[PDB]
Design an enzyme around this catalytic site. Structure first.
Site, PDB file in Angstrom:
ATOM      1  CB  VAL A  60      -1.239   0.000   0.908  1.00  0.00           C
ATOM      2  CG1 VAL A  60      -1.610  -1.437   1.397  1.00  0.00           C
ATOM      3  CG2 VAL A  60      -1.127   1.026   2.017  1.00  0.00           C
ATOM      4  CB  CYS A  61       4.242   2.069   1.363  1.00  0.00           C
ATOM      5  SG  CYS A  61       3.983   1.598   3.063  1.00  0.00           S
ATOM      6  CB  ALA A  62       4.366   0.254  -3.740  1.00  0.00           C
TER       7      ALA A  62
END
Lengths: 167, 166
Positions: A60-62
């Site tokens: 989700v960071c990506a």
């Protein structure tokens, strides 16, 4: 003292307080991809989107970095800073691999007291030592115009509310 | 302190790399699943500590792939690849490259390791990273070999390191 966010519902402790609208944000020094030390004051006179996340190498960071990169394109007078505990080397690998040219990646490799000053330091459990997921938007003089400490770390931050503050 | 080099430029590294005969300090580092792994967990096995600046740079990556091909012939040994990379970086790399023999560990937590093993890059652009080093431990954590690589852009001496295991 602490904020509480969650990971798949499980409570995760985060030290300090995320800056709030109206506060003066603290100048910080973080590590850019050439390994030079970059101060928030270098961006004086520009607005700043701080997209803070646990790690570019998780899903989700990506997603948030691709998203903000695509959105940075039509932002006026704004730098988008992608900030985490990743080494500068991971961050630039990802942005180089994915063709993500707009964002500026910054690492807490050095300047780690940033996590403390921005209330994003996870202090307990398997994620201790990483930053939580948060968005802070700053004006040209480092006043907070928006912030969001994302309640559930497995969800993306609210892109549209964040960038509304820039209009 | 100790001095090594990066493209000829001195780099200081705090501490002192353990030497043959020394009892190596019991560390705890972060494994790929974010659990905390102690050196004592490897009791009765020899350990090869491959310590480098970051797996996302070329010399470090070459040594992890080499140690990984070599690890398969080793007897009663685990090969620990150690750096200040996040566990996630270490896992991405080993999974993309099929490097299934090594165990990656991160100084995400347990950062007193760097000091204890004389590998903490102190000043300059590399500050906050480990220097390049190989320490080989016996089943009981005595040092049977160590090398603090003099020039960071060169690979460690694989063959000498692994000789100590025979």
């Amino acid at each position: 003292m602490t904020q509480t966010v969650h990971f798949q519902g499980n409570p995760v402790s985060v030290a300090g307080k995320l800056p709030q609208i109206g506060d003066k944000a603290k100048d910080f020094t973080l590590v850019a991809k050439d390994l030079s030390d970059v101060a928030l004051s270098s961006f004086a006179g520009k607005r700043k989107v701080l997209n803070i996340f646990p790690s570019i190498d998780t899903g989700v960071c990506a997603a948030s970095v691709r998203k903000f990169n695509q959105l940075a394109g039509e932002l006026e007078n704004t730098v988008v800073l992608c900030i985490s505990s990743d080494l500068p080397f991971a961050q630039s690998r990802f942005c180089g691999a994915e063709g993500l040219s707009n964002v500026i990646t910054l690492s807490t490799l050095r300047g780690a007291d940033f996590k403390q000053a921005y209330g994003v330091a996870i202090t307990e459990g398997p994620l201790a030592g990483l930053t939580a997921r948060a968005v802070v938007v700053l004006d040209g003089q480092d006043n907070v115009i928006y912030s969001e400490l994302v309640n559930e770390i497995t969800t993306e931050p609210n892109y549209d509310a964040a960038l509304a503050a820039l209009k």
